[PDB]
Amino acid sequence: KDWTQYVNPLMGSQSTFELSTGNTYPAIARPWGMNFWTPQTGKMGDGWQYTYTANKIRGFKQTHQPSPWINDYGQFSIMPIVGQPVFDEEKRASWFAHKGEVATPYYYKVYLAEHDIVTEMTPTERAVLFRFTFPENDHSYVVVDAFDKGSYIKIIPEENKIIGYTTRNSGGVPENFKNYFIIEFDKPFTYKATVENGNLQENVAEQTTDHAGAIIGFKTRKGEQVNARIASSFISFEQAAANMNELGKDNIEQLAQKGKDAWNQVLGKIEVEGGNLDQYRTFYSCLYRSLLFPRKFYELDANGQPIHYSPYNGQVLPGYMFTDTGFWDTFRCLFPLLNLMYPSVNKEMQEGLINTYLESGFFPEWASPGHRGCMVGNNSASILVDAYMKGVKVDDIKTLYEGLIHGTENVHPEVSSTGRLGYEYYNKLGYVPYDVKINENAARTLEYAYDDWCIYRLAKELKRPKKEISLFAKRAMNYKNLFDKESKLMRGRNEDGTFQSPFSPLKWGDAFTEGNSWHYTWSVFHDPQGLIDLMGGKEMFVTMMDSVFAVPPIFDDSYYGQVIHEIREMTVMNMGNYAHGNQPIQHMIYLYDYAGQPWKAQYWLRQVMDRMYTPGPDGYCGDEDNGQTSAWYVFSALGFYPVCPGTDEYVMGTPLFKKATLHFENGNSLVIDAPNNSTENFYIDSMSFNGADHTKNYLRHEDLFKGGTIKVDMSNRPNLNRGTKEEDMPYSFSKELE
Numbered sequence: 001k002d003w004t005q006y007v008n009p010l011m012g013s014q015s016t017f018e019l020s021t022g023n024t025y026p027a028i029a030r031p032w033g034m035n036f037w038t039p040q041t042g043k044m045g046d047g048w049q050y051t052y053t054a055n056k057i058r059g060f061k062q063t064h065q066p067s068p069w070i071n072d073y074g075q076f077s078i079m080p081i082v083g084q085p086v087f088d089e090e091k092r093a094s095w096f097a098h099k100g101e102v103a104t105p106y107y108y109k110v111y112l113a114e115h116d117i118v119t120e121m122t123p124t125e126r127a128v129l130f131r132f133t134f135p136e137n138d139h140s141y142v143v144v145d146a147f148d149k150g151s152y153i154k155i156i157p158e159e160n161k162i163i164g165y166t167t168r169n170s171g172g173v174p175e176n177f178k179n180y181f182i183i184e185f186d187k188p189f190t191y192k193a194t195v196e197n198g199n200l201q202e203n204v205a206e207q208t209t210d211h212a213g214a215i216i217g218f219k220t221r222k223g224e225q226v227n228a229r230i231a232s233s234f235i236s237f238e239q240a241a242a243n244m245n246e247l248g249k250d251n252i253e254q255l256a257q258k259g260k261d262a263w264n265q266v267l268g269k270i271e272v273e274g275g276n277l278d279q280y281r282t283f284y285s286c287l288y289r290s291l292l293f294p295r296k297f298y299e300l301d302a303n304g305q306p307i308h309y310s311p312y313n314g315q316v317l318p319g320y321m322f323t324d325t326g327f328w329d330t331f332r333c334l335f336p337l338l339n340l341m342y343p344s345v346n347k348e349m350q351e352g353l354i355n356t357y358l359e360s361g362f363f364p365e366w367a368s369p370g371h372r373g374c375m376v377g378n379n380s381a382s383i384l385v386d387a388y389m390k391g392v393k394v395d396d397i398k399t400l401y402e403g404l405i406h407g408t409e410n411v412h413p414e415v416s417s418t419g420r421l422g423y424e425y426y427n428k429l430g431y432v433p434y435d436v437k438i439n440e441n442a443a444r445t446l447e448y449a450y451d452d453w454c455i456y457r458l459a460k461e462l463k464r465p466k467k468e469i470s471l472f473a474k475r476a477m478n479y480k481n482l483f484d485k486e487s488k489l490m491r492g493r494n495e496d497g498t499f500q501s502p503f504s505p506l507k508w509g510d511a512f513t514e515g516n517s518w519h520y521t522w523s524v525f526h527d528p529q530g531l532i533d534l535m536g537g538k539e540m541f542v543t544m545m546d547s548v549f550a551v552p553p554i555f556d557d558s559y560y561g562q563v564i565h566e567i568r569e570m571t572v573m574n575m576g577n578y579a580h581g582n583q584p585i586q587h588m589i590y591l592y593d594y595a596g597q598p599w600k601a602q603y604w605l606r607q608v609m610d611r612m613y614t615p616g617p618d619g620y621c622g623d624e625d626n627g628q629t630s631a632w633y634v635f636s637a638l639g640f641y642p643v644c645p646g647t648d649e650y651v652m653g654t655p656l657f658k659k660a661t662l663h664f665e666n667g668n669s670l671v672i673d674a675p676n677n678s679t680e681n682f683y684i685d686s687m688s689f690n691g692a693d694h695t696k697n698y699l700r701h702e703d704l705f706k707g708g709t710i711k712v713d714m715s716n717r718p719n720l721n722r723g724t725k726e727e728d729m730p731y732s733f734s735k736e737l738e
């Protein structure tokens with residue numbers, strides 16, 4: 001049974017700076033591939049490296065880029081051509097169309113109109129096989145671009161080989177950073193020239209220069225297939241040569257199929273049925289996107305043991321290592337999806353995190369490949385703890401604990417988004433002041449508070465001294481310190497203790513991060529009852545939640561000086577202030593469950609699943625962000641969501657398919673049966689879990705792992721009585737102390 005047929009790698013590529021519909025590129029790769037490959041439409045250096053609207057392809061690129069904002073490293077490209085041998089990235093470019101293009105997660109094909117050449121490629125974790133089909137011609141060449149900012153290239157004719165290294169990067173790299181690559185052709189060169197800063201140097205074997213390049217060529221007869229075996233490494237040329245064995249002796253088709261099996265082996269852990277083709281495509285495309293980042297950043301040694309170039313100190317060290325994720329996005333539901341469906345993969349990730357801390361002094365927040373200055377919060381604490389509480393345990397709990405503590409009282413000296421910016425204020429005043437020139441201070445405060453709740457949880461589980469437990473228990477309630485009784489919202493707070501004036505809840509940025517108070521106020525994943533309590537009780541809380549959907553999408557962009565795409569994205573949806581396009585509010589709807597109106601969540605979640613996700617190139621309503629916006633759909637379509645990582649709970653929403661089946665790593669399975677599900681039947685009239693009636697609005701990790709069957713009675717009417725009792729509510733820190 002093949003699920004790859006549903007995956008559309010182009011979903012997200014019809015995106016512009018002014019309005020995101022995903023901001024993705026076609027990532028032709030294995031699951032968590034160390035090296036992704038992609039057609040390249042944009043010019044070198046542009047974060048929009050492939051846009052669906054582009055007329056021309058200028059190369060086939062090894063890329064690691066996690067987003068057009070973070071940009072790229074370890075990047076070089078290859079491009080077959082005919083006619084004059086040109087290195088220029090514009091002159092070598094060829095028209096193409098999508099009806100002449102085939103994109104799968106394991107295989108990519110395209111017809112380059114102006115060269116009359118077909119290109120195909122199938123990657124492994126670290127290597128890729130290209131096959132170029134050339135027309136009849138005296139002058140057929142292949143261009144190899146090592147990119148600029150200091151690269152290297154050497155042609156080695158007596159082995160039909162080219163080698164090189166690329167360094168162009170967007171920060172986050174040690175001084176010795178290099179991506180080492182090798183390229184073997186199966187046809188001898190009849191022409192060879194290296195390129196040096198735009199200059200063609202025929203029969204000059206090698207260059208070390210700003211922008212190194214190489215062009216090789218030959219005579220071709222009609223339909224002649226030239227294959228290139230490619231691999232790279234962050235360690236060395238000798239390791240790059242070892243990586244090339246990934247390719248075995250396979251040709252395109254045999255590799256494609258091993259690639260397709262690899263993907264089916266992971267997509268197939270979740271089988272959905274009983275929906276339309278749109279839904280299958282949207283679901284499995286989203287699932288695929290959730291299985292890409294963070295990337296493997298280790299390589300296999302001669303004995304098949306994991307080793308890695310540290311992007312933190314530049315040494316080569318044994319053990320796991322991953323990168324290219326921003327925890328500010330991915331703590332929310334992406335890493336949780338991994339603890340549920342792929343625990344053994346996140347095991348390697350956590351081992352990796354431990355290695356990051358040993359090698360750099362901090363657990364990372366945004367990493368690409370080393371520490372990068374981007375976003376806010378200390379949400380690594382949530383990643384680390386949620387894993388552990390879910391049975392994904394690192395070997396060195398001692399180091400784990402120390403690293404957590406370390407980041408609660410240090411910010412990284414060159415990367416302000418690593419450790420906690422403004423911890424001093426936060427540890428003393430219980431919040432980050434609005435007026436001390438630390439932006440996004442209210443956002444930092446609410447996340448730090450949650451992050452401390454997680455640490456509290458781990459302190460507790462580990463039998464730490466009551467004094468560490470208590471200190472984090474207290475800090476966990478730090479969200480109270482920004483709550484404004486009048487507006488019933490969170491609000492920037494001055495160093496002296498007075499709230500900032502004037503206050504606009506519609507202002508984006510400033511106190512908050514790419515959102516406004518209406519988006520950020522809900523960031524109390526560990527204690528919604530505490531937030532209800534703050535607002536005056538469930539009814540008022542509900543009244544506030546409704547407003548988010550009902551108010552016009554007015555805004556205040558002064559902080560940014562332009563209508564950034566996250567704002568635009570929100571405005572166009574006609575969903576009030578509900579900005580699903582950005583991470584901070586993405587859990588909000590499930591909150592209804594906590595106030596005893598689960599039917600409202602069910603309504604709104606289906607509106608989102610139905611309207612805000614489509615399977616085409618313009619598929620998302622905002623940035624995808626490395627699994628987060630996608631895993632959201634995956635979770636929601638199954639019918640529940642990790643509102644609060646660190647707990648063992650998944651908060652109930654409403655399933656999208658008539659039947660979904662989870663195959664867990666432990667050999668057990670779980671069938672979620674919604675036989676009456678339909679376009680109109682989105683309310684849950686009742687549930688049962690293995691014959692036992694289930695009224696609660698949450699599911700426990702441990703129970704799901706046991707397997708069996710959950711039955712969902714779908715209906716078009718809201719059941720005003722199910723899920724309203726105190727015992728039906730998911731976890732809030734305020735409750736407890738019990």
Ligand SMILES: O=C1N[C@@H]2[C@@H](O)[C@@H](O)[C@H](O)[C@@H](CO)N2C1=O
Binds near residue numbers: 326
């Ligand atoms: O301008 C940016 N938009 C996105 C953010 O919204 C955030 O989701 C990403 O982690 C982060 C990195 O992609 N981003 C930016 O820097």
Ligand SMILES: [Ca+2]
Binds near residue numbers: 582583623625
């Ligand atoms: Ca975003």
